[PDB]
């Protein structure tokens with residue numbers, strides 16, 4: 001007797017974690033496929049609730065963009081919350097990276113620049129609406145297949161001004177954010193995107209803390225396994241510059257000559 005059951009037919013579980021479950025579903029009325037997240041309703045006044053609120057109100061603000069996972073609807077039923085999003089048939093960037101690492105394929109220089117540009121366009125859009133994503137990483141980039149990358153998982157999204165900062169994944173987190181400096185949050189999304197491209201390029205698992213973590217925030221790129229041009233390398237280096245004002249904005253990113261291609 002539920003809306004979920006009523007409007008959708010559930011095809012396959014495509015994700016699970018502390019966030020709950022995600023299902024590939026067909027909507028009966030239109031025959032389209034959607035990714036529907038089903039989670040227990042968070043305790044009131046909890047982090048989980050704060051997180052869930054950041055996401056509903058990001059949708060309220062953002063609307064539709066070709067490099068952001070489209071949001072269609074959200075509701076609550078039983079003791080659960082449901083979020084209906086666009087289904088990206090290529091899964092997440094994280095999955096693709098695992099898969100490259102398995103059948104030994106790889107993301108080429110060219111394809112790495114394409115990833116950077118496309119996610120950059122998504123960020124440029126979010127930033128222009130005075131928001132920041134604050135959890136950019138492979139598992140939150142989705143792929144549609146000839147290939148579109150789309151930013152999803154908006155649960156950390158916050159305002160540039162008066163930001164409610166739930167810190168993202170420590171692996172991708174810029175030092176100034178850890179230092180409780182929120183005067184240039186957009187540049188933290190930039191830092192994270194650079195490390196996201198480095199992952200796609202085949203780097204070893206990023207450090208969660210300790211010496212190697214600090215070395216990166218000193219502006220040093222993790223070791224790669226392949227041949228990146230000096231100029232693409234420099235672009236990635238400056239995106240993880242200790243000084244966030246030295247990092248390009250999303251708008252300067254997508255107009256950069258190395259990416260024009």
Ligand SMILES: C=CCn1c(=O)c2cnc(Nc3ccc(N4CCN(C)CC4)cc3)nc2n1-c1cccc([C@@H](C)O)n1
Pocket residue numbers: 014015016019022035036037069083084085086087088089090091092095139142152153
């Ligand atoms: C709705 C919620 C968020 N979300 C989207 O907005 C969204 C859009 N497209 C897709 N496409 C998609 C994802 C995974 C697969 N795989 C099927 C094959 N197996 C082997 C690996 C997984 C296939 C297709 N998935 C999405 N969401 C989703 C799925 C899972 C986990 C998470 C986060 C919580 O980590 N998010």
Ligand SMILES: [Cl-]
Pocket residue numbers: 183184185186187
């Ligand atoms: Cl800024």
